[model samples]
Target: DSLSKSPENWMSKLDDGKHLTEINIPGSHDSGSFTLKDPVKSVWAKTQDKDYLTQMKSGVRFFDIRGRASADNMISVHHGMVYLHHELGKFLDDAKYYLSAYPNETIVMSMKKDYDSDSKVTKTFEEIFREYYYNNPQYQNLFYTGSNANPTLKETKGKIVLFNRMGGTYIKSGYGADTSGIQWADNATFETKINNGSLNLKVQDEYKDYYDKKVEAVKNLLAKAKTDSNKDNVYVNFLSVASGGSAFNSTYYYASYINPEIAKTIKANGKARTGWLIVDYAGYTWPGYDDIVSEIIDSNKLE
Candidate 1:
């Protein structure tokens, strides 16, 4: 092949000089929950069925790991479900398994915290993550300490870049601004859902053809990023939404209907760029989920 960079190992095939921001990497949204197969039915709770590890295996290099504080000093994964113990360590362990499995790819993890979600919960989460997720010495080498600087692939062989959405002076690590030291991105999916002033969490039948808009919004965000020259932030497009409008399962509707369409565009455009197409569901029904990744990897090829 062109550079021993098969689609399976495209990350390694990249030029060491390549900045992670410069490429279109596939990603997972709410990568925690499993897919439910219906936009209306599944949008209320879960997004995708694939856990962290499953996503990584299927060519996904970006993760949205929302951490919440639990009870008695523990952490739990949540989309503001509760002030929740976050199992960030388990999530990282998933990354560690794959990162070491094939020292070729890099995983960008965006750790998010609820804003004034629960002060006690926030403190607990910060402490627990600092103890488990951030402080784990064994996996320290796997993390890129640049925080916000743009690093070439050569410089980040087997490391995971921590895109701390928490911002400067966090309760845990010494990460910097959202886009300065480590890149300000807590809103990559973000701009589509959160900053868009749309339903950040639970949507209940208000917007028209809500399912249709999720995909439309992300692509709009993608095109907008294409116009910008900013390379520090890896533009993340989230093809998901909370329970709103028709309540279609964002994940299933995404993989089944929207994903294929995106692939079709890439097949035609060959020149299109996907900052990071983060979906609610992928690899659930087969190629519908799989092809999205194929499209992205193919587009990055040096013809």
Candidate 2:
């Protein structure tokens, strides 16, 4: 159970010959947010307290790196309220470094829009990659080649698997990458559980709203991903929230209360299969977060 203290290096447990679908991946949402702050839009906006490298060493194989076209046409890691300068360059470098240290390890990085739009954002992100990342031989070749089929570790050694949510072509564009928006049913339609029945305390009412539904929604999806046809798909779950401050408290605390429930289910379910359980605050703020990572690593062990 303590196998993932080096976090899950869980990627290290899979058979090199197995398809990526058979591998379980623990992920971090807003993969670069330690030095970030709450956006004026919401006090609950900040969702992470650890930066990417620490999360990587702690067992996060997938990264939810939100971005947009920077002022100079470069990419900035954006957390809605935060826009980072010169991070994309170092971010990819860290992934490459990890795979170098653990030759068999794999990375699935999902880049999405924190601001800007398709023609305005993704195309420049593409150009920036060409100018900075792809221009470098060392980085370009380390990414998995594009193909519709899921890759085996044998096929993806030392490569970063692009979960390109922003979508335009990169080293492993189109079919060569894993599907980005699959099962992307809005995880936020959970207002159903809020404002129900009557009377809890009015002052603390928002905590019940912000806390339970996100955790419940994620647990349901995790179980669903472990069974039936979904067993083969790359399932991604966002463990985040927008209701806090006047409602809950902080996004990190919401996840902290919820992470353990998801962890307990993953362990007890026996047939747990979590493809990419994307999260916030797991490496630092959420207690027992690694237990969830451990269960995911344990679930993906080659049969």
Candidate 3:
């Protein structure tokens, strides 16, 4: 019942031997932010226009997922402390369903603890994640829990590659070698390695800033990704930002200005490896601008 009409099975056309870092991947920032019912909270919190399944249909391969643990050890998706309608199980179920239907595709998911757990819960975020991972045998095979952070498409097809940002030693053992503690500064451009330096992660996520400055930050990373990046390096450029101080200044407001610039830059760059482009309000199309997710996917035609 959760299935959507497929716009395309774009990944089937990609070379099986291609490295994951070599392809341009469109990702949704705060992917679970959809389904926020409150008018007030949604304005500030809702980053995605479509849910996971819809985003996947629109060719979004990467997911930026954040969650908080509950007293019962259940994990719910959240945008900071604000709950975004569903739990982590629902999101995982959606991914499983989507992957079952489109086995040709691969999903690169970054899981992070955006907010502290419920006051009643004593368990660490990683402990809760472990429960979810260990308890669900059905899900075990779907996750690519190997050490190779930058695996070939053939190895990762029909799988959810865990980009663990949750910062733990256990996820490294449970998920993979790459799931070792991630290096995430407040909001800065940085570099780190995983899989014993087999994979390089270059990141630019200066979110708390003015719209224009955020644009420049995204563009700077984009230029570097195209020119300076190699097959082993994975560039993560976030096109989403929290622009203004007021609650009235929302993600949608910032995205409207930021998306167009990112879209145009991707268009201008042609078929080049732009790495993981995480964005807000993905898949929207206007008169002058193209579909942002589709534009990002078009960059993968270098086969």
Candidate 4:
């Protein structure tokens, strides 16, 4: 039950005033893609094995959450076209339960509207999100809805900090700091501003490329995040890359090699921050590398 002994309560050991971006956080890409209902879709779209709660317990502090809106204005978790069999309500409840138990932890959630919804649906993605999540009394208190784009760990303990990735009239409105200020183009690495330059984001999300290219891209960004002078910048280095080449060059294949490579990098150099190193199949042990989730949490000690 002690905070210093468990990865689940890692944040409790850090100074409460430290910025969330300054920490080396372990995050999962396509966090809701763990369900294996559809065998065929699991080949290309599935990116995770353990569900949200398990990943949190394993020291994943951030999540890449994607969902689709249906005719009833309800949101269902998704990855591309495949429904990940998780509803938004259930996911938030799980988050609430976890955070309530470990009040020292915080979850950074990047929510995106993944696929087109049913034609019969009248509400836009923003409307559904507001109705089901933002304004809904059942879950409103669980999120950090303040005007600040980057909050200190003390300000957001036991709360979900929404990293808005979608657009509408609510783009710059009072949401989780409208992270869409800079265009998040597909298959690219770029620096962006959140909430009108309130916070900086050094992002590397190069999917739809070859496995080798993705590996190099991930390493390049890892080096940048580690050496950057600005400690305020949040570096989001995604290790999961979906290949468009042969079927063998899928997310699973990319993770098998990329995970160990990054593990080696983090282990070799322990002086700088890793930022939010997002990945697929997080917590899976490699041949000779420690589980990335624990390694990333360990990297925080360098701060």
Candidate 5:
């Protein structure tokens, strides 16, 4: 009922000059037009710094590498963190450029991380459901069901009903390996084993070699793009896309089912800190697609 309140009703009592106004309407209910007159001024700012560039570069690399459907193992986390650090480094380098461009304004760099923790050892599906329903009561009526083995309204009930009926095990597995047990010694042991040539094997060796090659490919692409005058704009565009990686189709689909609360968690955390901008592109097959394609049209000339 509160959402149904009309803007026209509120506008009718306002003095014309007292309120700077904007109106949006749809010619059809599905289409919309928006108009703003004498609107409050807003500023557009850009950051051009090494840190920003690095962050963008690292973010793209992370998204590319991690998006691969076949990637597995604890090494995923290690690589992901490595990519994130690279991104953060880029942001820090770019901070000066952004500050100079904005002059008096402050430039902030943030990072975020999300993972699926649902399991028998952690929070249960029922606990998750209870929390969701408790927080989102507007959907309460949509979830109510009659007590019957096969209720008459069963077919009409929403998926939430089906989820409950299915014994709350609708969400299971699809979680990353427990990182709690990983130790510094484990890291050192793996590195030593690989370096000392003691860990050589047929199957794992191929994967390890492939991953190394993939990382190199991404790094080379980034290096070339950084230097190529024609591809200067690639950095910014790549950063924009990579920064929005959490919402990217690949990442969202793979991670969301097991970690449905991630979107909210990310929002509750600041946009910058959520690590959404730090992505790995090597995981995906479409290489260099996220790189900057446009030329650097304008220079800030900030010194």
Candidate 6:
């Protein structure tokens, strides 16, 4: 049995058998200060002491909660992403008989909250996914929503939106494209008008058309994720602002200019490529904050 810093009294003495089979919670301190009044009894005591229930019954679960991405109201990053999506949907509804003979499976749940904003506001990844999915519908029905122009979910078809261009050069105002260098002042009067050049060519042409419409909406959603699935199954989620204060600096500029041109347009439109998922709610005070989890496992190691 492995119990470091109390694994709920050794998962209640191994669910009362007391044989002490196994336990290891060694991956400690990936950003601190957590409290959500026992997030599903701390993810069922860390998935029954890291047996992780056959990867949560082979739905390919990857649950991560790294802390502190504050918009303040103290540690309530949308109530810890709806309390770990209602404790991983009640541990997949009590493991639904091992996920009903495991069909076309995939479960990649992620949450990263790293915050100490150096500016860049006026949110929009469609207004932070419609104000955190209309104020958290149990972590917004674990993704897959519709209509910003016909979307209907075959595993959340496609949506990619990212913006930073060096934290939109410190959002001098509210609402995007640098709101007239945020009403022409404050923040040491816009760093003394960017050291006296007097910043404003109509706010650098509205921050260069908001950084070319955020790289043309991430190249038209990685080319509409190649016909938005006939089981193509693409998933890439990012909402950015971090750069100099690093969460590996927008994961190294999204692996050098947006994931190799969306993995060469998903290997020339044959599909089966896109799967980089990152959804940070808060927590990064960087010194390579655990190298942003090995740079999101080396940008989803492509395959």
The list of candidate 4 runs beyond 4 A from truth reads: 1-5, 168-176, 179-182, 244-248
- Candidate 2 lDDT at 108 equals 77
Model 1, span 1-303: residue lDDT tens: 632224446787666677776677777666655523444445565666766766777677778777565542445566556322235567777788888886978887777664333464545445455555565675677677553346667666577776555543233222232222232333233332221121121111112235576556656665665555555545656655555434553435545676776666656766455576666565554533336766777666453
Scanning candidate 3 in windows of ten residues, the lowest lDDT window is: 1-10
lDDT of each: 0.57, 0.60, 0.78, 0.78, 0.20, 0.27
lDDT of 5 by residue, 1-303 (tens): 110122112212222221010110000000000111111210001111122323322221111111001111111111221222222122222433433333222211111122332233244323443344312454343332333222221222221212121122332211111111111121011211111121211100111122234233323333433333321011211121111122223322321221222222222332111111222211122232221111010111111
Q: Weakest 10 consecutive residues, lDDT, candidate 5?
A: 24-33
Clashes of 6: 15
lDDT of 2 by residue, 1-303 (tens): 444545636566667877665566777767776666535433455666666677777788877777766644467787763665446777888888878887778887776667773454445665565566545665767677655355676777677776545544434342223222222224342211101111110001122245677676676666666773432344556666655655446666567666666777777776556656766675653443435656666666455
The reply for model 2, stretches above 4 Å from the true place, is: 5-8, 37-43, 71-73, 117-123, 134-138, 146-148, 168-209, 229-232, 285-290
Question: For residues 1-303, could you state the per-residue lDDT of candidate 4 as single tens digits?
Answer: 333237778987888788888878889999988886565567688788888898888888888888888755588888877788878887889899999999989888887889998788888877788776877898867988665566888988889887777663363333234534345768899986666676677889887767788888988988888787575588889899885556565677778888888887887887577888999998777666656776687777623
Clash counts for the predictions, in order:
34, 6, 0, 0, 37, 15
**Which of the two candidates, 2 or 4, achieves a greater TM-score against the reference?**
4
Q: Which wins on lDDT, candidate 1 or candidate 5?
A: 1
Runs off by more than 4 Å, candidate 5: 1-87, 111-303
Across 38-58, the per-residue lDDT of candidate 3 in tens digits comes to: 867777788887888988888
- My TM-score estimates for the predictions, one after another, are 0.74, 0.78, 0.92, 0.92, 0.17, 0.21
Give the Å error, residue 42, model 6: 27
Q: Ten consecutive residues with minimal summed lDDT in candidate 2? A: 194-203
